[PDB]
Every structure is written in C-alpha cells, then in structure tokens.
Amino acid sequence: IVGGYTCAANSIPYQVSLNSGSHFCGGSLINSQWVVSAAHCYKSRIQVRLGEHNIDVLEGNEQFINAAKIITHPNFNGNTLDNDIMLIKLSSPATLNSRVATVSLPRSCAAAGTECLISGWGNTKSSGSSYPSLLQCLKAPVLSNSSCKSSYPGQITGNMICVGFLQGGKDSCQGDSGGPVVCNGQLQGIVSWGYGCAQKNKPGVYTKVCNYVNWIQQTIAAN
Ligand SMILES: [Ca+2]
C-alpha cells in the first residue's frame, strides 16, 4: 500500500497473509474454513497466516494453517485478468476470536462514491521498493464506471471496479494482491491489477466480488 497508514494492531481481523517461505499475497477469511484471494496469486503449496499484524515477528495471536485445496475460477483469463479470483480451503478450521474474524460477502454491489478500506503488506513506495512488516491501511472511494473506463480504454470488463484516486499517490501495489477491499462491512473488491502503483490517472482495479457470490457459495458446498 502506497500513501497509507499503519493499521491498529489486529483491527482488520479478516486479513490473511499467504506464505510459502515468505509473504507473497493477501486474502480474506470469509468463513472458518475458506479464504478468498486472487487467481493470479496461485502457487501449489500455500500456508495461510491468520491473526497477523507484524509479519516478521511471532507475536502470539497467530494461527498458521496449510491450504488443503486451491480452486481457481474456471474462466480466469491471465491476459485480461477477468475473473481474477481464487478460493482456498484450510486443512483445519480457523478458530474465530477477537484477532481472527470473518468478513461478510456483499448483499449487493456498491454505489460509486462509497468509501472503502484496503489493507495489506505490499510495497509502500512509488519510487523503489520497501516492504513493511506492519499491516498497512488505505481509505479510498469506489470510482464510477466512467472514470475507470476512461483510465483503461478497452480493458475494464463487467467483473472489475476501480477504487482509489485519480491524482496518484494513494493505491495498492505488488504484494497487496489477493487482499480485501471492504466497504460498509462487505467485501466488494480483491486487489487485482493496475499500471504500476499510485500513478496519476491509473487507479487500482479490483475484482468485483458482488458478481461472485453464487460461485463462491456453490464451490464451498461442493468441496
Ligand atoms: Ca506476527
């Protein structure tokens, strides 16, 4: 996250870190056994780390649980990044508490202007490269479909939304992929793609979670 602030410890209890030797993407706990993330984050061994704040230090609220199943959306397209969404089943259930909680799926899609919270441990800098140990946060608005599509002509599908700022300087970046965009208590976005990070007139684009409730529910029921 560029242009963000350090979240209060454990104040984002649905946020997960996916790890295979080190942190590489985020994710969101949506029930005690299942995490949602980005298909482009796929690797075939993942460990899920719940209840994290400082990824570099064992702090003692953490639960580390390996993925038992990894299910990428059957229409994920690695060229357009359409359907950039993936479900992970944990090999045993998360224990839910103060520091570890589920986030709601959307009851509908969100209006333009709605303020949301975006979180993750990705790159913090426009020029260069510094990855934080402490979880970062960013408040930003859902942009209209028109400001999203003027930013990326021909490349915004119906399963994508733009969240952020046209003046640059505030956005998600590499390492935040897979991570939550939460608006009015509902997960409406997954960190997906952009052109660079925090560039003027290239806000981040996000998988539009509201189109995916039926697929998510069905996949959980069948696995
Ligand atoms: Ca820790």
Tell me if 54 is assigned to a ligand binding site: yes
**Domain co-membership, 204 together with 114:** yes
Cα–Cα distance measured from residue 15 to residue 26, given in angstroms and rounded to the nearest whole number: 7
Residues 96 and 21 placed together within one structural domain of the fold: yes
116/199 same-domain check: yes
Resolution for this PDB entry, in angstroms: 1.9
The residue type found at 14 is Y
177 catalytic? Reply is yes
Is 52 annotated for ligand binding?
yes
Is there a single domain that holds both residue 115 and residue 85?
no
The approach used to solve this structure was: X-ray
Catalytic residue among 84, 151, 171, 176: 84
Going from the Cα of 19 to the center of ligand 1, the distance in angstroms, rounded, reads: 12
Does 53 participate in catalysis according to the annotation?
no
Task: DSSP for 131-192, please give it.
Answer: --SBPEEEEEEBPPHHHHHHHSTTT--TTEEEES-TTSS-B--TT-TT-EEEETTEEEEEEE
User: Does 57 count as an annotated binding residue?
Assistant: yes
Domain that holds residue 21: 13-102+211-223
The bridge status of strand 136-141 relative to strand 115-120 is antiparallel
3-state DSSP helix/strand/coil % of the chain, to nearest 5: 10, 35, 55
Query: What are the DSSP E strand ranges found in 38-175?
Result: 47-50, 63-72, 86-90, 115-120, 136-141, 160-163
Cα angle for residues 62, 64, 66 (degrees, 5° grid): 160
CATH code for the domain of 65: 2.40.10.10
Using the mean position of ligand 1's atoms as its centre, give its distance from the Cα of residue 192 in Å: 25
